[PDB]
């Protein structure tokens, strides 16, 4: 039995699947804890580790392969479901296995993506602090035609002090807020001005470690669902650019509230693809 988590059908992934769109020749690189790449309802196919002792394909934390379990949990007859289960899923290994990682780690990364021509890159991490590296890493990215999604960040709302992370800060990043099962915001969701869109982030059920599946709350879990959207919409329209993609999710998510605390509000890929 396939268990098909409440966040597929909020965002209407599993309309556009239905139209045969699954992001098959989309590469999709998680910069994370790395991923169980023996993990049954995943296929790694590639990836690099800048995390000293620790290779890509193993992951001793849970966090990255949770991430990529949102992503591309394969389709078939056990475990979960991604929103996007036919692209091609590519490990990169930026933090270690206490979930920490420091600039040129991840910037490694970020540019290892690059380099490697992957599609889309996803960052579910953040830091109170930036950095040039980094912003630079991001811009070039983007400018050579990559979607950078990112985490906003889990700091909530106390306040009215913008509590965004890095590198979802950053303009060519997509910074993501989360969303529980009834499209309410959820309350540890960072709050301000570069908030970009919202997906679902509480209670979120994916790929686990040691080939299981549990259920996780933060931003980091509604990132990926924005990555697989993104995804989708390259699968079914190749030959748009990055900021193409990233116009189709702002332009048609649903509207929730102020944009502070929202964004343009939750993402619909059936909209954003058509
Ligand atoms: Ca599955």
Same mark, same amino acid.
Request: proline share 3%; net charge neutral.
């Given at each position: 039995?396939?268990?098909?988590?409440?966040?597929? *059908?909020?965002?209407?992934?599993?309309?556009?699947?239905?139209?045969?769109?699954?992001?098959?020749? /989309?590469?999709?690189?998680?910069?994370?804890?790395?991923?169980?790449?023996?993990? *049954?309802?995943?296929?790694?196919?590639?990836?690099?580790?800048?995390?000293?002792?620790?290779?890509?394909?193993?992951?001793?934390?849970?966090?990255?392969?949770?991430?990529?379990?949102?992503?591309?949990?394969?389709?078939?007859?056990?475990? /979960?479901?991604?929103?996007?289960? &036919?692209?091609?899923?590519?490990?990169?290994?930026?933090?270690?296995?206490?979930?920490?990682?420091?600039?040129?780690?991840?910037?490694? @990364?970020?540019?290892?993506?690059?380099?490697?021509?992957?599609?889309?890159?996803?960052?579910?991490?953040? !830091?109170? &602090? @930036?950095?040039?590296?980094?912003?630079?890493?991001?811009?070039?990215?983007?400018?050579?035609?990559?979607?950078?999604?990112?985490?906003?960040?889990?700091?909530?709302?106390? @306040?009215?002090?913008?509590?965004?992370?890095?590198?979802?800060?950053?303009? &060519?990043?997509?910074?993501?807020?989360?969303?529980?099962?009834?499209?309410?915001?959820?309350?540890?969701?960072?709050? !301000?001005?570069?908030?970009?869109?919202?997906?679902?982030?509480?209670? /979120?059920?994916?790929?686990?470690?040691?080939?299981?599946?549990?259920?996780?709350?933060?931003?980091?879990?509604? &990132?990926?669902?924005?990555?697989?959207?993104?995804?989708?919409?390259?699968?079914?329209?190749?030959?748009?650019?990055?900021?193409?993609?990233?116009?189709?999710?702002?332009?048609?998510?649903?509207?929730?509230?102020?944009?502070?605390?929202?964004?343009?509000?939750?993402?619909? /890929?059936?909209?954003?693809?058509?």
């Amino acid at each position: 039995a396939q268990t098909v988590p409440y966040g597929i *059908p909020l965002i209407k992934a599993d309309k556009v699947q239905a139209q045969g769109f699954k992001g098959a020749n /989309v590469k999709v690189a998680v910069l994370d804890t790395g991923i169980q790449a023996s993990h *049954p309802d995943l296929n790694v196919v590639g990836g690099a580790s800048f995390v000293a002792g620790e290779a890509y394909n193993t992951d001793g934390n849970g966090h990255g392969t949770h991430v990529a379990g949102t992503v591309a949990a394969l389709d078939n007859t056990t475990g /979960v479901l991604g929103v996007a289960p &036919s692209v091609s899923l590519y490990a990169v290994k930026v933090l270690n296995s206490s979930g920490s990682g420091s600039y040129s780690g991840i910037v490694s @990364g970020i540019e290892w993506a690059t380099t490697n021509g992957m599609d889309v890159i996803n960052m579910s991490l953040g !830091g109170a &602090s @930036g950095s040039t590296a980094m912003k630079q890493a991001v811009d070039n990215a983007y400018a050579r035609g990559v979607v950078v999604v990112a985490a906003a960040g889990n700091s909530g709302n106390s @306040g009215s002090t913008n509590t965004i992370g890095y590198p979802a800060k950053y303009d &060519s990043v997509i910074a993501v807020g989360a969303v529980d099962s009834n499209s309410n915001r959820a309350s540890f969701s960072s709050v !301000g001005a570069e908030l970009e869109v919202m997906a679902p982030g509480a209670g /979120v059920y994916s790929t686990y470690p040691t080939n299981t599946y549990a259920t996780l709350n933060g931003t980091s879990m509604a &990132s990926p669902h924005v990555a697989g959207a993104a995804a989708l919409i390259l699968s079914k329209h190749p030959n748009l650019s990055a900021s193409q993609v990233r116009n189709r999710l702002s332009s048609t998510a649903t509207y929730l509230g102020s944009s502070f605390y929202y964004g343009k509000g939750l993402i619909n /890929v059936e909209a954003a693809a058509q």
